[model samples]
Target: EPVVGTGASLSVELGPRLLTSIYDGIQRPLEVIREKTGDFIARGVTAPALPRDKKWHFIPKAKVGDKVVGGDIIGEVPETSIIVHKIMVPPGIEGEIVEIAEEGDYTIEEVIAKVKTPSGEIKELKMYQRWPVRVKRPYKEKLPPEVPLITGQRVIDTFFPQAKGGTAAIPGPFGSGATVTQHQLAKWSDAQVVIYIGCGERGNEMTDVLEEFPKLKDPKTGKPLMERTVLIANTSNMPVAAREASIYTGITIAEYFRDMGYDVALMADSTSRWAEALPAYLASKLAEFYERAGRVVTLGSDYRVGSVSVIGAVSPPGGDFSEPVVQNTLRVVKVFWALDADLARRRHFPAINWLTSYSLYVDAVKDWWHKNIDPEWKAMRDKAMALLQKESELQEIVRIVGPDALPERERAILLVARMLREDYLQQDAFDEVDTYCPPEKQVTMMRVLLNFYDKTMEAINRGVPLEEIAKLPVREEIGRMKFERDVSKIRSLIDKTNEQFEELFKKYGA
Candidate 1:
């Protein structure tokens, strides 16, 4: 620690063990504050996020005279139900362990180990280290972000894919389902740890998340989602300055988990408000964190581990993109999932406008999708996007003249676009089965919609009118495929789609 205005050297401390804990802005545990400060919480009330006097049974990995480097796992402590706390050698200190503690129980403040530096200075190491919320932790190296993040929402995973180490922005106005989308991602994204910060959102919503997340089960782990999740609440009722701390606190914790060689994701709701609260502080920090988001080659495995993927929601006051906070957030993220206010008014939940939204990681993960998914994925996605785009163009003409005024081919495009939206794009998060979408399911569901387009087009060419093909009874069954839980049901649904389309083609003899 250095005195301000002294111009002395500054040092950052790392190597703290993290477990399942929730905190307010400034890293104070709400439960600890409630216990210490008379059962009610106030802004700026201080307490340790981690338990202060609680002891852990630390087991030694490196013995006396064992040579170790920075970030080497010195020991392990089964810290909590979901997290294994690996105590590591912090940076700038690398040498043999001249003095060490035995396998036993001790509190966080107690010196559990000691290392002699190469320069002959002995340093005492503890279980906890405090780092300034603004400073970044170290990683071995960073690699290109190639794999998809596996957000279970089909709109995200299929259309606008976010990389595992990518950054994304969800910008929307009031009632635009930004909060719901964030909650959905937090619930279902495939990450070992989720650091969700409710920064400057409503108090009610934060409470809902706090009350609801514990009951939500992890689809990947078959346990409660809270086992590997951390929440940081800084509602609008909190102090202006403290809400700014919430995003930093959330991200710092994410970086800690990343250093532990675990894949972690940090989510900040209403980050635009974090900027509106602190104009000066937000700029530099946003750039740094966004630039630093990627696969870090940290300590684990032959390929290494630990990557921090960032997703932040921006709520502009009036749904204006010109707002500085919204603009800045847009620049920071690689993927843009633009939610539409009109769609929200239409009561379309998660109204991420298909034509407007995009993911820049398509090139990076192209090979991954090509290998794991269909070899025809790129061509299929482009075909779907083109259909949606063509529909958007035709709608303006229909607004003036009506669907009756359009030619059969143009109207054919319109029907297919509506099927894409209803059958594939729109999803019900409240549905027990539809809430989470697996990748295999995404491929089949998408192919069914595309196949509908192709078979209808073939019928249209066979002297069958566009309106007749649109009115086919098979459309309802195709629309129901998104809610089907079983993968077996999905492929069978595709076969049914083909069978129905084949019947149409044969009936018209196309």
Candidate 2:
């Protein structure tokens, strides 16, 4: 047994170092780690997040005898090409500076200053300090998540949506596009900071990530995507404890960025491997870390607040979702993207099973979408989803008998469902143009597609056959719209679909 402090003071790094580039599982700079370790994937490797002895040119912004507390950024270090690592006083500790180091080059362990507490005890403040990765930093309040975490993927951005401060899970087994889907999110997600943890998986996968990410350009900024990203690679070559440490390590980093008033997204690839730990040993720990996401935190005294959203991917053996990891994660996450191997086999890139995958954030995001995008946007979404669901049920029936057994109206639903799957939901991840679908464009695509269904149904009610509606030239053009790089092209295709629909109404309207 050990003695506990009266108030339970935590020693922590006063200032957080910023990155214009990537880091490893423990926040160690990977470029620096690669240079030092000279090992493939840097196995069994550990290094300081920042330089241990490499001098950071620091400038004093606050003086000795000045009273300071948590969230106070008292100094600044120009850490890299673009980030001025803001030195903040760690949360829950405040004191008057008794002695301060003058502006100079110094290692993190060096005491930049000494704070004299009200109780007359001196506390040394260093350039960097450590805190347990499992703990969450304090915050002022939690806020409602209003904005969508736009990934530009049609299935996610258009259908199963999440907010900036949301939680999501993409679960699948091998070859189910789990890894590929996550890589796309990290590449395209609209967050200021993307903390991607390759927690427990193959080294080659990490290698692929490490190899591919730096080369990828941000679709919005044209800057290298890695600039705003942090990659923590702890593949299976590492110890289980090492893999677990990275899990906690990532959320803390995300919270740190969240404290800076940035919408930070932390994506852990395949929590399945991280789940291999003994059940009793890891249960409480997993729950504690996931609870850290989807919160609004007051960054500091400047009335600053930011959101942290988390995305975790889980891979179950033999596609068995009853596994402990998948079951446990399903309890905490707000969105579920069930990646399907059958869909992958069919060459549907994302392979998300729309029938099974869902987002609880959809209703919450409804009003926001209605306000920002258009009125009836939510209605359109619901109608589209209803059609999809109905078509799914109808398919089972069709499977037992034949398509000829169904009425024309029910048959039209199947026709439109096939169009929706092929034209709208299926996206080419590798195609330069189709890889990203903006939210506004997503609305446009949904509008024309659903518009076609509305008009065709009205025609069928008047006795026009479903086959005639499918025969129109617009179906082919709408399919081509998916390949268009420009939103203008997509919108242009909608006008064509509308014209063709009107033509059909004139030719066939009773």
Candidate 3:
């Protein structure tokens, strides 16, 4: 109205130029900005340089007589063999540097320098005892873990869903993909807090997490990797006593956070080694081996009372679950993710022995899964479970001879189990498939596959050759059904497939 022509927007053209000039003017007086921002403070003790390797070099940014405040980068280390670049100080108070120590010549607890503050105050920052911070239970309100903890892994979410406060110990044999499973839980589970205890593991293993974590982005927040995650690392090279303390230390920290009403998930890499250290401590106290009901005890009620959910990994030297650590941990936790060594050799993702892996929280999660997925999915799950058991027995028998030797009914059951494993139970994490299947989809897939198998069985009973039933066309149909069935479309497909199967059965006269 006021002569607003389309020549050029004057404000827009000059906006960026004005902002640039303003930024330059503000940055010109950096000294004033520094004083206004406050001084830097160091958080931890001044211990001697404990370089991981011999190649690292240190450069002192703050020397004697230098006035410093919090947030100042007092010193820097050259990039070397060590992956971590240690930042010597944190932001807090201002002081004058009084002493300087040479690089690569300090003990673990020796102070590198002294700082004199403005008020003539001297503080001694020495490395003291790093003991476990025990967080006592505030009230006696004990509740059983009931809420489902969604782990974006198919077999786990469907068959063995862990409760929110539930504890699950993953006892994977050495080189049996134990670490991979732990990493999967840490990355995928919807736990509020995650406490990882590296009990006497390799330092490089911890290094991988420390180096990799910061680079990852959270799927939910679209921010940098979870900063809430705490790591208690006691490498294989550390003192055995310290390694034993690390587990309790980690649990104590988790309890502290949990007392503030946060749901905490704690994972101990392997309790087997921790148990080995315990016997020595027990022997010293009791003047003999500590036994409970004729068996050596590794943990008791005192360790379990804190607001902490502990999941331990027990490594059997030869895939033996009868090991003391495995047995002891089983008594405390409700759920178990048992990794099979033999199956691992075949490159199975989960490698969980379904028969052995039990979930105490399974019944509680069934209704929730049904409500979220589909109402009929529960019935389908029950039917599939029955079939799965029969298939297991048939597969054991088939292993003795060959698949071709089995009769029509037995062979059909075995094939169904194989299909269930491949199409339903197994999932590729990289593919980003939905592990949390709605009840409708679960029921639909189960019904369609089982119905198709029944129809195929009828064809076989009518003297149809095994070669024709196993043709590419029939196989492709099963694959297509599996791909197309999502939760929303499951019921419709189930109804359509059931009708189709009924017509086929009537025509074939099974």
Candidate 4:
């Protein structure tokens, strides 16, 4: 048990640190047991191999009065056109099979055998099964999201810090770092709870997370990755209507935790498909509006506010953001993290066109941000942004003439942009570079780099040898300076920079 700062004077039995520790120590260990036991436990019906075009053969795994140990392989499929698959009947709590289905018979989700285990436990080996359900509505509160959500990935932490309860949409075309960003967020963010909803995406994506999660270690706890996470998989292979339900299902779950006073973060991977389903289901209603009332009633706000905070990824099929789904979602979410496919092809990890991304909550968190971070962070960020505004012109000139033809200042600006892209923005998730960097670090690093660039430029202007300025001593000096001066201050700067970046583009023009 740990103390928490809240209105209630009575301390809750658990706090974030204790909860995280318990999850890492207890819940994670139990999940491993569940995974091991799951293999032995038969879930859906297994049919015996039959001739192509022939009726399927259902063979029971256990017979009446058969006692089996857990993980005992009992059911065997008969040989036919395809190879027969073996079914394992697990000793579900020291149980004996009381019934068995006749060989070569077909059963439609029927219970083939019942097991009476020790300690009054009964195991019914049914043909079909559904995962357990836990659902609840999240409570509504006016408290603002103040705590920083850190992604150790330099770019996200320094340039786009997602606050707890802050909604941020990640728009990346297929194979354009969408899943990579989601995985980074799941592994890195400081939120107490992370709900990932695989809405209308492929099953392989969800499988990748499920298979990889247990193997990965938490940076904060040094334990398996399943703690502080919940995955709601509604793959594209599932029914279309079910795909739509998956998003709400995930949100509802997140809200349930949030209402319990947890800082929850929910990511809906590609909500466009779910958006498309709405039109498909209500085409008649839309048509009736034009034929009768001459006006259509849009989806109400009440339906939109059901969850804690939903960051929906909208992938435009043809790289078009003007699509109905993206447009509609933009109106609902507060922040947009747009990834350009063209930029990704050029190997940009974030692929965030600074001009395209925006967050509406910039003003709400600004004062707390400035007080906590370095004063110079905002100025440096603004300068970088000004340079970004001229990127189009710089790119055009480089294309027509060449890199050598540009003025020194313009060339330096371009180089800085390039460095920012390569050094700060790009993230390698596989390398486990996912950690929440504090704002102070962001500011310290940026200032050090900028100061180094200024000194180097000054030397160039004074006719000093370029070779001298480019030497290892200067680079080492910058690195050392960043490390030596106020580590806490540096982290605060980084966090502040990230928050400002998110807020800057709320009205990103097209």
- Model 1 over residues 399-455: C-alpha lDDT tens digits? 888876787888888888988888888899889889888888888888878887888
Better of 2 and 4 by TM-score: 2
- lDDT of each prediction vs. the true structure? 0.73, 0.72, 0.50, 0.48
- The numbered model that scores best in lDDT is 1
Per-prediction TM-score to the true structure, in the order listed: 0.87, 0.83, 0.61, 0.57
TM-score-superior candidate, 1 or 2: 1
Q: Which whole-number lDDT from 0 to 100 does residue 343 have in model 2?
A: 84
Best by TM-score: 1
Sort the candidates on TM-score, descending order.
1, 2, 3, 4
Writing each residue's lDDT as its tens digit, candidate 3 over 22-108 gives 100011100111111111111112221122222334446668887755333344443322111222332234588787556653332
Pairs that clash in candidate 1: none
Off by over 4 Å in 1: 1-18, 31-46, 63-65, 98-104, 172-179, 202-219, 236-239, 271-282, 299-303, 471-473
Residue 402 displacement (Å), model 3:
4.2
Q: Residue 502 in model 2: shift from native, Å?
A: 3.2
Error of 1 at 210 (Å): 4.8
